[PDB]
Design a protein around this ligand. Structure first.
Ligand SMILES: N#Cc1cc(Br)c(O)c(Br)c1
Ligand SMILES: N#Cc1cc(Br)c(O)c(Br)c1
Ligand SMILES: N#Cc1cc(Br)c(O)c(Br)c1
Ligand SMILES: N#Cc1cc(Br)c(O)c(Br)c1
Ligand SMILES: N#Cc1cc(Br)c(O)c(Br)c1
Ligand SMILES: N#Cc1cc(Br)c(O)c(Br)c1
Lengths: 116, 116, 116, 116
């Protein structure tokens, strides 16, 4: 599991469940090619987006559908979504956890990058 | 001043100075029309991006060049940039402060929305 | 104004108004001498806590009554309060802005430290 | 495992390893009785602080020694420590993860509270 995304709800103090996201990889021609997608589980985590052999160096973009999460709780949040864009594996293969901590008018995103 | 962006450096505990950013507005055809740009001042703030007459309802995107900020300081950061995408003035005219708090591997963004 | 505290509400996207806080300074005998107190204004800011002459080196503690803020709004929060403890003026006189960004189950605190 | 504390380093994008912390519980007489202690492991997590039978309702305080973590990397950080104070189990037994995300001049703390 070289890429995992974890989403937390800072209002309820709970995993953010059923949050959709779409991952892209920058192509050689500067275009965003679709790379992976899924939704967070009951623990707020999305595992299995990619594999070690597929997850080569590149610039990746994770678009997290935070607006639908809040709308489903009845709230019009501030942000349309939360995007995380990063270069991956520039110094060799790494395992990435992207964490997103969500409030209606604020979010934080952090990367925990480890070497297996 | 209906739109102000403020950028802080969580490593040094200081305003993030000379941070470039570009602002877009979603057009009727789903495309990002360029809207405004600037660099943060010595206080970490970028004022004067737009006016009340021009800052109509819409979806706006602020792309903050955090990567160049960190590179200039002797640190190679995780994120390529920090993007904030939001609907503005839906209810209607408001003043927005977008704050971004930057660390090399983490950032948070918050909106402070007031009614004059 | 060598010490200012600013409190923001990440749920509503607004200054956190009428938030009480108490400031202490560690005495020579390791005890917390009461130092200053106040409530945030309509802008979420509390100014005038101390003066340059009084704000000497030391360890200071800011206790922010976040629980009463949330309770007053119809939310029972996780934290009893938000405490910020820091050494001040070690190198030497600085101006400090302490920012606290509040959610019911999460808060962040950052210091913006400048040299006049 | 009804109480777990996880500490992350937002500068390096890594678990914060070997971070010491001390946990207290408010006694009937308003005094802080020592409750548990330990240090984070290689994953930045501290497990096994308490048990279900011991972890009764009460107000608990977690003092995280963030200053030593930064000093050991050569840095004089802003905060003396990071304290988290909360009422636990007021509505029945819950499992608590306290996460702390650390930068030299900023930290955030979030609670993820679940019902087994
Ligand atoms: N694989 C894959 C995949 C990538 C993106 Br980006 C998507 O939006 C969806 Br739907 C699937
Ligand atoms: N922010 C944040 C954050 C919170 C939790 Br709890 C995690 O397990 C990780 Br990884 C990151
Ligand atoms: N007005 C304006 C303006 C908008 C965008 Br976006 C830019 O990247 C630059 Br340069 C200027
Ligand atoms: N000056 C002062 C002052 C300090 C603290 Br410690 C207080 O709780 C209050 Br009331 C006032
Ligand atoms: N975090 C944070 C934060 C700090 C400052 Br000094 C601000 O003015 C705003 Br607005 C947000
Ligand atoms: N059990 C226990 C225990 C609690 C706290 Br307070 C401590 O600081 C240490 Br040392 C141990």
């Amino acid at each position: 599991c070289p890429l995992m995304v974890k989403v937390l709800d800072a209002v309820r103090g709970s995993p953010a469940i059923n949050v959709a996201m779409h991952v892209f990889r920058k192509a050689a021609d500067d275009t965003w090619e679709p790379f992976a997608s899924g939704k967070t589980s009951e623990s707020g985590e999305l595992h299995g987006l990619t594999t070690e052999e597929e997850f080569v160096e590149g610039i990746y973009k994770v678009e997290i559908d935070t607006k639908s999460y809040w709308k489903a709780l009845g709230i019009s949040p501030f942000h349309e979504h939360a995007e995380v864009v990063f270069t991956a594996n520039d110094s060799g293969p790494r395992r990435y956890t992207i964490a997103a901590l969500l409030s209606p008018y604020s979010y934080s995103t952090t990367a925990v990058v480890t070497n297996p």
